[PDB]
Design a binder for this molecule. Structure first.
Ligand SMILES: NC(=O)[C@H]1CCCN(C(=O)Cc2cccnc2C(F)(F)F)C1
Ligand SMILES: [Zn+2]
Length: 139
């Protein structure tokens, strides 16, 4: 679990979106595993606007933050899950590192801010759904 709170937006993994998220839906993209909903209170997180390929992510299955080198956002084949069939997920960044399903939502950050959130993993890899191209979160 985990979310990003910026302005009047709540960014969560689409497969973990709640009834409240869907009733206050702003945008969703199943190929990115992202959903944004509207909130009453203002959020205090800052989205990174950069091409950083190093950062730190929160790993709930380890109660630890880990430093990682990650790939640029691209179309990567994501294995069939209980939430989605086999498919290419776009705007996904891979890193060598630990993850388990309950880790989705953990934030990946650089000096510039929130880079994205854990969305895929397995076999010693962790995939993050990028949020840096979504400039409308700033306004
Ligand atoms: N974006 C996706 O298709 C998600 C759908 C449901 C969640 N999901 C996974 O369970 C992938 C997975 C399997 C084994 C270890 N770690 C992970 C993960 F949690 F992502 F880190 C992929
Ligand atoms: Zn950065």
């Amino acid at each position: 679990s985990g979310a990003i709170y910026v302005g009047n937006y709540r960014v969560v993994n689409r497969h973990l979106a709640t009834h409240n998220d869907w009733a206050n839906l702003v945008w969703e993209d199943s190929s990115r595993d992202l959903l944004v909903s509207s909130t009453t209170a203002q959020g205090c997180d800052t989205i990174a606007r950069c091409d950083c390929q190093t950062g730190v992510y929160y790993c709930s299955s380890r109660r630890k933050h880990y430093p990682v080198s990650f790939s640029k956002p691209s179309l990567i084949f994501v294995e069939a899950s209980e939430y989605y069939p086999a498919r290419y997920q776009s705007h996904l960044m891979l890193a060598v590192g630990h993850s388990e399903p309950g880790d989705c939502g953990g934030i990946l950050r650089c000096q510039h801010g929130v880079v994205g959130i854990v969305s895929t993993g397995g076999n010693g890899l962790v995939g993050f759904a990028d949020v840096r191209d979504l400039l409308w979160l700033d306004e």
